[PDB]
Every structure is written in structure tokens, then in C-alpha cells.
Write a protein that binds this ligand. Structure first.
Ligand code: NA
Lengths: 574, 576
């Protein structure tokens, strides 16, 4: 088909600037970070115009207290390095950077700038520690028992989140003046967000096996109670996650919470009209609410609420814009009676019924939400509708649903994926069906083509697992433990659920995209698969790529990993 | 930053450009052309400024028609690129309706002629190469051939052809439609090159000797050979080194296309006929005028009238792509033993001088880089690489002696010629950095260069490559087993010692492997073993295996998939 058009469109989708809202600084300017093709810059936004604060690209910026007249840039000390330096920029003098020399190179994990002290967590060779940098120099407030993140500061009280053991995220506090550490264990749940009330309590999002709650943790005694808000929109929403929360300067509590792959914005419990998708932090700016917004049809952008009008968004050309046309959540009926929550991104370049890709997510412990995805957008741009099923094993729909995969790889979850394909069929969406996925999704491609021949017209398997038994034996102890958990410790399940053992059954074209030198997705087992495919007469395409990396950031990453899947599907279509 | 979308747009347009091959004259004076158009290889009748498509699904070729026959025999791969072909008849009055010739099971069809009453062809199966005759009554094996063999011409009961029956030498052969059998004629002077049966039932053949070519008359009844005297001396004074094609026209005149230094000339009964600079194919008589094909490094294959040179059918390139070729030249590179390697150089209008340069190594090995259109070289020129195309020993076009030097010595003197062309590029001031790329025997040469000459090139692209002579032999059809024997001088030691899979530890440069999965000449299995070795020995590489495709690419999509990875790879290396 139209190869150069697909490439031009992929270039634009890769290059589109994506924005996140960091806070309000200086006198009522938005601090926003923009990401374009693996390059991060920080900006002041003030009504139409953006002004870049940093010189060379950065990693991130620390969280500013409302109105502070400076920004703290976090920047990799080397190309790719996992160690950082801190640089201050005065908001009145953008582009002029002052290296914070008192802070040696370390892995900067998080931070908040009070305007009087930069309070941050960092990992060195020796430790993870909470630090404060002020006029007198650098102080270590506390050593932390593992990775921790500062969430908020009000006066001398510091609140944060810690991966301090037990499998879940604890809350912690420290004191700006005297340091120390107080940890508040999350019990059956896991803390997701925290902000300090004007009354010096820690409001926190506490995610659980089912619904998330908003709790008040008293830092004087560790008492935890459900926090009741003046408006009951938030509690009647029944969130499963709490993304972020924060007190606004007027003392009202802003909460962003999620359920079923989309978020909602609340101010003192009252829900605010917001564009469908997912949202980030909320600020009050010139007396109006502002957030970031993303969806399957919309790259991360800054919007005004309640209108949803974009204040800052990357440009896509009209033609590409119209190709990526609208997302929706459908509950697909599987075999169990179970209902598989499935996102659908419609293509403006495909008729209905049209060519449809079931794009299976990796993990498996991950979620397909209504959030911008370069892969789904590229497929839509190339004239495919995209179906993204949260097969059992997925996160975002409670622990019971995630746990269903355990013991049963290439079982119920493959039935869920197949259920989503039949639904695409059964609803009038799909004229023809393809499967594509990476990581566990690549494994699902192979499982589909082996266990459900005739379901899909062709399949793309990226960074797939081909044989659990071999993998278990090749692997490091972390990955070995996962394989042991997934398979229920049965060598018999390792074998029967391994697609290399069922190559005879494949009847459809298969494209393999695979890293040449990735430690946890090794090439040898894939060479075996290809040998098995060739021996048994099967149509296959293969692309073996050195240094594939682990995110599609640049056009080069896309050309290596995404383009071959798209060109392969486009040629299989016609 | 690599200009990916610009590269794809250029590569797609250069692939897409229509290309034509002249095949004969059928029915009511209609030209029979094979054309790449609408993204695939098809067969067409041309007459009265219009084409009519004969086939439905894409094809590979057609059999040579006798003049005025009322059908065309399509040759189509029915094995998704593995080159097991079937034959399909189309009546010229009913284009687009195909009758499969079911009496011929799929096999590798090598050549053929359709008299209108007998379809005569050569084909290779697992156990033999054979000359076949097919009629309304059935299929006959006229003779088994001791190697690759090709039907050249039929007049009456007499069949003439050419055979690779030993030592890289080409023999003439005859058979009889009525009675079959095989007579082989070998020259002690060189190799026969094309053949056509005179009205007097002699076989006129090109004879390529050590350093020149000439025309001879072979009497098939007693095997006598004499020089053919022509009524014009232009041919003889032209001093050709190779014969491209010859054929008797219906009016009895003898058309000869002969060449030297990678450009051809057209002669009718010895007389030189004005033709566009480049290379020409077959000459046909159409409505009393001469028509041939024409190509050059800047000119995709087209069909032209002689002596005007005016095209009847041609594809056009847009100005931007036309300017991306700044020029071409033949240079003579001095090799390791003093031999002068005739080397075509395609200068990019998009590269500085000195600039990034690709040594693009031809396949075969019995093939040549000439002043003839090369899609791959044009794509490289468009992506900002100069292209150096060396006629390493084993190449055609420069005499039997140069061609036969390769026999028994793969990855020997011919690799030194490739390496000397590379050195010349750098030493002459053309090349700022050097890459190697090739397909088939050319991909063998990439692998041989990176194993035997580490550090000469910055990076290599090996497409459809020979990896291991030994395993390829075991997997080869009767024809290819024989050919492999000839190339290796029958030595299993040469088979091992000259296979790059046995020298993977020596590789120091980045390598891109490209291979059609159903390639039946250079199979995929040894490539998978090469990948295992590269991995075991900690070498960095990328690989691209193309589905439902083989050696003979006949669609735009498969061409894009075999070419684009190479250009992307080289573009990226250039920024390294
Ligand atoms: Na997703």
C-alpha cells in the first residue's frame, strides 16, 4: 500500500509535543513540561505564549510550591545515565541555569521546592535518602528503607510515599527542621498519593483490592480514617485509583481519580466537567481550573476546565487528525460470563465494518486505558480500527481480575482476547481481524495463531515468549519467580501453554519483531521458533533488531519496532 | 537525523517506475512485452499506442513466442517465491483468461519457446534438468541435460540451446522435436553465448573467447564450426567482448546485440544500427521496423524503435530523482595480481566528494555491472551514497578468461577485486567512508568481506546471501547442485574453507541480513544457523526475513521489503 504515507504519519505521531502540567509559578504562570521525540523541556505558559526555562534538554522538574519564583531542573549527568544534577532557573530569567553544586550526582527520585528549601529524595551507591537544600547547604533529613518519593510539604511537615517493603506503598512523614522518619503502613491496601491539609493532616489516596478510598492520616499518631467531603460526587464515583491529589491555595481539595480506564476531577468532592480520558494534576490559574488531559485520540495536552478547551497542545495536521477518530469502552462478553473491559479506537480511514487490529497489551499486569498510545494511533492512521482488551491478568479492574491469570497462561486470558475479536466481528466493527502485541501481547499473538487458527487473518508478535520452560531455565531469579507464579509451578503448564510446541497448527501469516540482544527477551528461543516455522512450511516475516530499548521514543525506535508491524498489516490487508 | 520518510518516498518511486522487457511479436503484429506496471510484473500486448494486459495475477516471465503465434505462455511462481513455476496459456484474442498447462507439474522453469504448435522448455526438478516438449497430446522429455540448460531457438524440427555442462563453460546443444535426443557441441576456444537457427538449418552462435567474441556457424549434422561472414564489417570492427543476444528476423536478416565495456551495439547482417547509449535486449521486426529494449544507469528498461531511439513504452522519473544521479563512469581498478577490474561508478548528486560510498556487489556470479538500470544503485544515489559496482573476476562482459577465473576460487581473487575497488574509491578521493552491500552472490561477498577483510568496510548488507556452500548444496535442486560443483571445482574443502559461516569470529563490523524466506537458490536454513553463530560469538547484527517471497521479486511490496531495510541501515550507519 502507501508506505511513505504511513512513515510520514508515524513521524508526525512520534514528533507531536506532549505536555504535562507541573504547577503554577512566578506570578500566575503555568509550569509545563513538553516531551517531543524523547526530548524533555520545561516551559512557562502565560496566555498564548510559552517560554522555555531550560537550555539543553532535561529529565524532569521538581514540584514547585504555588507561585515560587524559580524552577529546579533535573538533568541526566550523561547520555542515558541513571544519575542526575540539579539546576535552578529563576522564572524572571529563563534560559539562565545555575548548577546546584552542593548536590553531588545521584539518582534523583522526586522533589518539592518550597521556595526556601529544595526537598528531594535521591539514591546514591550507599543509600536512598531524603535531603533538604537551603542557605546553609545540604542536609540529609533521613535514610529511607527503600525507594521513596516526596509528595508534599506544608510548613515543617514533609509527606511522601515509600516502597519500604511488604509489596505495597507506605506513607511517610519527616520534619523539615529536625528530619527523622515516621512510616505509616498501608495494611491491606497501597498509598497512591498524598497532600497535607491546612490542618496538618495527611490526606492520602489508599488503593485496595477493590475501590480506592480517600483517607486522613493524622501524623501525630498514625490514626487513619475515611475523609468525608462536602460534596458526595467523589464517593458516589467509586474510584478504583486515585491518581493525584492536592490542596489548592484557597484550601479546597482537588482530587483526580480513575475508574474503568478514565479519570474524573473533583474539588471538595464535587465533580468538574472534564474531557473524556485521563487527567493529571489540577491547578487553579487565574481563578480557573487547569489540568492535563490525554485520551486514545488526544496526545497529552493542557486544558481549561470545565470547557475542555486546550491551552497548550502539539500540532497534528488535519488529515492525520481526522484519521484518529474517537475512543470508547465496551464490555465484551467472554466465556466465564465475565465481562472484559475493552477500549476501542476508531479509524477515520477505515469503513465500518473495516480492518481491525486486536492490539494486546504486555505485562501481563498492565492496563489498556483511554490514554494516548503511539501504536494504536499509528494503526488508526494506517486505516485500522484498534481493539484493546483488558484480558484477565490486567490491572485497573481490581485484584481478583488480575489474579485470574495465575496458573492459567494461554487459557482464560486468550479466551478474553478471542472474545474481543468476536465482539469486533459481532458488533459490526470488523470486516477482517488481525492480532498484534508486544511482550506478553506478543506471546498472545503466538497463542492465538496456534490455539485459535482461523480467528485472525495475520498476527504480529513482538518481543514474544515462545517457550516458558526454556525461559524459566534461561532466566534471572526475578523473572524465574514470575514464570513460576504464572504457571502455578507446573512444568506441564509451562509446556502445554508454550506456543513453540504447537507450530503445526498455524495457518495464518506471522510477523516476528524481536530484540537481538535483550537480556530478558533472548533471541535463541526465537531462532528456534523460526527454524520450526521454516521446517513446517509456514509463512513468516522476521525483524531482528539490536538495542531495541524498552519504549518507542524516537523515529529510529519507531522504524525498528513499529513500522514493520504496520507495513506487514497494511500489506496483508491488500 | 535520518530522513526516513524522504528515503521511503524515493525508494518507492524508483521501485514503482514502469519497466519493460521486449519478448517478441504475437498475433496480428502485436508487441509482446513483460512490464512492471501497477506494482507488479505482468505481460502485455502493445499496438496502436495502447497496451492490453494478458495475465491476471502477477507473473515472472513468458516463453519466447514464434512470430505471430496466437497465444502467450505465462510462467508463474506457484510456490510463494520458491521458484516452482507453472505454465499458463492465454489466447491473444481473449486476454486475461488463463489456462493452466496441467500436464506440466510445478518445477523450476529455466527457459522456453512456443512455436504455436509445441511448447518447448527446460526445467529443473530435484533429480534432473530436462528439455521438454508439450502438445495437446501430452508432455515429452526430449532429453536430460547435464546441468543448467536453456532453449535458444526452434526452426522446424531443430531445437538449439545453451548449456552450463562443465567448468563454467557454455556448450551449444541441439535436439529434435520429433525424435528428441541431445547433441552437445563444445568449443575449445571459449563459451557459446546465444544461438539462432538460420533458414539453411545451421546454428548461428556467439562464441565468447578469452578476450573477444565473434559469430560462428555450427552445422548440427556433423558439428563442424566455421566463422560467419557478414555482408557488413561494422560488427567485426566494433570488436565486441560479449554477445548479448542474436536472432534471425522473419525476413532472414540476422540481428545481433553485442557489447564491450558495459555498453551494447545493435547490428543487422553486420551493419551497426543507431541505438540509444546503454544496453539493448532482443531485436524484433514489427511492421517492417526494428524495435528493441533499452536501458542505462539513468534509464529504466524501455522499449524503443531503431534507428530513431524513440520510445514506444517507457516509465518516467521525476526531476528530483533524475538529478540524484550526478553521473556515471567506467573506471579500471588495479587488483591484487595486476588485473584491471572494470568498475562502474554512479556518482550521487546528493553526496559530497569525498562522500559516503557503497560498494554494491553484483550477483550471479556470471553477471555484470554495466550501463544498465539498477534500482538498488539508484536508491543508494537518492539516499546520498556514491555507488561503486566492480566487475570482479567471474563477471560476464569482459571475455571468457575473466569470467572463468572464479571457477574453483570463490572468496579468493574475486573478493580481492571487490576490495581493490573499495580501496580505489577511498584513494581516488570519491569515498569518505565505505560500505558493502549485495544480494545473492553479492551478499556472499558482503559476508566474505566482513569475515576476511575486517576493517575495510564500516558496515555490510548481505541480502539472499550464500552462507554455507555445504548445507546449500544438500538443499539444492539438480541444477543448483551441478552449478555449485562447477563453482567450487568439485571440492568440498573449497565448500568449507570459503563459507563465511566458518569464519564468524572475525567479523568486527555491523551487519544487516536480508533474506526472502522462500529463497530456493540461497535458502533460509543456513542463514538461521548464521544468526545463531553471530549471537554465540557476540556479534552485532540485524536481520529481516521477508514473507512469501524468494529470489525473483515481482511486486513493489516485496521490492520495498528487501530494499528499504538496506537503505535504512546504511543511512543510520552514516550518522554513526
Ligand atoms: Na493502551
Amino acid at each position: 500500500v502507501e508506505f511513505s504515507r504511513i512513515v510520514r504519519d508515524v513521524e508526525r505521531l512520534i514528533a507531536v509535543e506532549k505536555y504535562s502540567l507541573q504547577g503554577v509559578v512566578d506570578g500566575d504562570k503555568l509550569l509545563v513540561v513538553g516531551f517531543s521525540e524523547g526530548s524533555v523541556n520545561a516551559y512557562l505558559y502565560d496566555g498564548g505564549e510559552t517560554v522555555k526555562l531550560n537550555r539543553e534538554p532535561i529529565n524532569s522538574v521538581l514540584d514547585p510550591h504555588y507561585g515560587v519564583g524559580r524552577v529546579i531542573l533535573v538533568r541526566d549527568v550523561s547520555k542515558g545515565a541513571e544519575q542526575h544534577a540539579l539546576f535552578k532557573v529563576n522564572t524572571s530569567r529563563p534560559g539562565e541555569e545555575q548548577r546546584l553544586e552542593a548536590v553531588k550526582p545521584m539518582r534523583i527520585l522526586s522533589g518539592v521546592d518550597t521556595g526556601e528549601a529544595v526537598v528531594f529524595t535521591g539514591a546514591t551507591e550507599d543509600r536512598v535518602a531524603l535531603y533538604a537544600l537551603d542557605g546553609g547547604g545540604l542536609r540529609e533529613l533521613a535514610r529511607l528503607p527503600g525507594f521513596g518519593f516526596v509528595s508534599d510539604i506544608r510548613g515543617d511537615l514533609i509527606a511522601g510515599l515509600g516502597f519500604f517493603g511488604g509489596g505495597r506503598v507506605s506513607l511517610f512523614t519527616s520534619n523539615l527542621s529536625s528530619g527523622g522518619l515516621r512510616v505509616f503502613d498501608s495494611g491491606e491496601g497501597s498509598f497512591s498519593s498524598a497532600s497535607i491539609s491546612p490542618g496538618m493532616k495527611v490526606t492520602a489516596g489508599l488503593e485496595t483490592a477493590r475501590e480506592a478510598r480517600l483517607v486522613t492520616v493524622d501524623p501525630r499518631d498514625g490514626s487513619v480514617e475515611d475523609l468525608e467531603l462536602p460534596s458526595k460526587d467523589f464517593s458516589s464515583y467509586r474510584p478504583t485509583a486515585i491518581t493525584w491529589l492536592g490542596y489548592l491555595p484557597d484550601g479546597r481539595l482537588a482530587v483526580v481519580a480513575r475508574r474503568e480506564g478514565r479519570s474524573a476531577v473533583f474539588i471538595d468532592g464535587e465533580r468538574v466537567e472534564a474531557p473524556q480520558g485521563n487527567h493529571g494534576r489540577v491547578v487553579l490559574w487565574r481563578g480557573k481550573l487547569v489540568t492535563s488531559h490525554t485520551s486514545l485520540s488526544t496526545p497529552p495536552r493542557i486544558v481549561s476546565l470545565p470547557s475542555g478547551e486546550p491551552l497548550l497542545e502539539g500540532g497534528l495536521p488535519e488529515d492525520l487528525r481526522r484519521s484518529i477518530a474517537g475512543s470508547r469502552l465496551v464490555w465484551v462478553e467472554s466465556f466465564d460470563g465475565s465481562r472484559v473491559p475493552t477500549y476501542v479506537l476508531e479509524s477515520g480511514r477505515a469503513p465500518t465494518p473495516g480492518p481491525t487490529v486486536v492490539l494486546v497489551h504486555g505485562g501481563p499486569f498492565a492496563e489498556d486505558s483511554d490514554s494516548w498510545d503511539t501504536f494504536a494511533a499509528s494503526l488508526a492512521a494506517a486505516g485500522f480500527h484498534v481493539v484493546m482488551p483488558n484480558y484477565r491478568g490486567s490491572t485497573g479492574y481490581g485484584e481478583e481480575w488480575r489474579l485470574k491469570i495465575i496458573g492459567d497462561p494461554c487459557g482464560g486470558e486468550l479466551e478474553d482476547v478471542s472474545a474481543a475479536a468476536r465482539w469486533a466481528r459481532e458488533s459490526g466493527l470488523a470486516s477482517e481481524l488481525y492480532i498484534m502485541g508486544y511482550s506478553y501481547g506478543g506471546y498472545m499473538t503466538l497463542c492465538a495463531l496456534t490455539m485459535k487458527p482461523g480467528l485472525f487473518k495475520a498476527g504480529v508478535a513482538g518481543a514474544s515468549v515462545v517457550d516458558w520452560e526454556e525461559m524459566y531455565e534461561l532466566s534471572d531469579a526475578a523473572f524465574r519467580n514470575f514464570i513460576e507464579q504464572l504457571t502455578g509451578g507446573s512444568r506441564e503448564i509451562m509446556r502445554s501453554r508454550s506456543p513453540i510446541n504447537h507450530v503445526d497448527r498455524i495457518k495464518e501469516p506471522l510477523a516476528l519483531i524481536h530484540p537481538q540482544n535483550a537480556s530478558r527477551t533472548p533471541l535463541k528461543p526465537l531462532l528456534r521458533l523460526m527454524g520450526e516455522l521454516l521446517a513446517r512450511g509456514k509463512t513468516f516475516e522476521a525483524h531482528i533488531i539490536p538495542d531495541a530499548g524498552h519504549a518507542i521514543n524516537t523515529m529510529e525506535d519507531a522504524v525498528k519496532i513499529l513500522l514493520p508491524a504496520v507495513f506487514f498489516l497494511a500489506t496483508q490487508r491488500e
